[PDB]
Each structure stands twice: as C-alpha cells, then as structure tokens.
Curated annotation (Swiss-Prot):
Record annotation: effect of changing Y13F: Decrease in affinity
Lineage, broadest ranks: Eukaryota, Metazoa, Spiralia, Lophotrochozoa, Mollusca
Known outcome of mutating R25A: No change in activity
Intrachain disulfide bonds: C1-C16, C8-C19, C15-C26
Residue(s) carrying 4-hydroxyproline: P4, P10, P21
Effect the entry attributes to changing K24A: Decrease in potency, but not in affinity
Functional description taken from the UniProt entry: Omega-conotoxins act at presynaptic membranes, they bind and block voltage-gated calcium channels (Cav). This toxin blocks N-type calcium channels (Cav2.2/CACNA1B) with a high potency (it displaces [125I]GVIA with an IC(50)=3.7-38 pM).
Post-translational modification Tyrosine amide, affected residues: Y27
Full protein name: Omega-conotoxin GVIA
Result of altering R17A: Decrease in potency, but not in affinity
C-alpha cells in the first residue's frame, strides 16, 4: 500500500488507510 499521510489518487484508494478524496492524501 501507501503509508498514511502519503500523496495518493482518491479513486484507486491505494493506501493502508484510504485516500482522502479532497486532499489526495491517505488517512
């Protein structure tokens, strides 16, 4: 995954804790 806080794409949700759609950053 991507680490929390990290610059990610909203729709792919490619974080361990989902990508915040508004900020492009993992919860």
């Amino acid at each position: 995954c991507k680490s929390p806080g990290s610059s990610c794409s909203p729709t792919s949700y490619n974080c361990c804790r989902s990508c915040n759609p508004y900020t492009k950053r993992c919860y």
